[PDB]
Write a protein that binds this DNA or RNA. Structure first.
Lengths: 151, 152
DNA sequence: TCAAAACGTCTGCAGACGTTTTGA
DNA sequence: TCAAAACGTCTGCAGACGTTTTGA
């Protein structure tokens, strides 16, 4: 587990607080026991001309990668172990995105348990609900009821 | 002329790099000797539901104010001296909006000498030109070139 | 004449989702 | 049956300007 210099984290929290997203999703997918995949994402967006900055993040954070989607580009971190380690350290300095950050951590820690009881999974899916409520969600389909109405 | 923590500035520098605007403008206005106002602005936007965060900031920075625009709110810092002191302290930590910041400090210092001679004033206008170019400028009308003409 | 505030404008996004595949 | 990658796309803005008014 890589440890981050505390100056880097202070700058990074500020950036994330202003122009970063912390995303939790329930993805309909029949090849899963309970028919959905739990998915977590940390994401930063820069215009494609400025992606030199997104590439530095990959170096400095040491994990994740960059995605080009035309006029704009993304830094993406989804791997569950690195994300946990990263949010754990970044969390104390967050002012606007702390709750999402903590809801993500608690979800990750309960992932092995959610793969067992259909009630534990369903309950984890309500945390996912809380994260999207905190964000400015616009185009959202698959929620916990969507799930409860399957089991 | 308040002095800020290194913990505050580092955080703030990240926030500004990510979500902050450094704006410079040449405003046509006939009450001025060279018929234009040189305007500088530091700006941050939030959804009004999260005003408190910008209100908090007014208090920590010690200056500037908050405008509710209906559904979004702006933190706005326009005052030249506070602006200089704020950016002079924040400038070494910026990784994206540093160039803007320097151009803004340059401008603030040459400001009194710019009011003395239309050639120094025109030069200063070529600095706001550069800032606009570093931003994602889309609706700009008054440039140093429209100042050159008018001053003839 | 000036610094600073006040108020107006808009369309190219972009935060935050979506669905499908890869590769175990 | 899973973690992650890859890729598609909507809608309320909001970044970065504009014009106008205030009051020493």
């Amino acid at each position: 587990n890589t440890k981050y210099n505390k100056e880097f984290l202070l700058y990074l929290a500020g950036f994330v607080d202003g122009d970063g997203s912390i995303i939790a999703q329930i993805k309909p997918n029949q090849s899963y026991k309970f028919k959905h995949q739990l998915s977590l994402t940390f994401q930063v967006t820069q215009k494609t001309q400025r992606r030199w900055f997104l590439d530095k993040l990959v170096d400095e954070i040491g994990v994740g990668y960059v995605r080009d989607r035309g006029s704009v580009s993304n830094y993406i971190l989804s791997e569950i172990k690195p994300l946990h380690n990263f949010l754990t350290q970044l969390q104390p300095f967050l002012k606007l995105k702390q709750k999402q950050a903590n809801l993500v951590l608690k979800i990750i820690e309960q992932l092995p348990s959610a793969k067992e009881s259909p009630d534990k999974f369903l309950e984890v899916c309500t945390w996912v609900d809380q994260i999207a409520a905190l964000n400015d969600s616009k185009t959202r389909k698959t929620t916990s009821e969507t799930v409860r109405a399957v089991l």
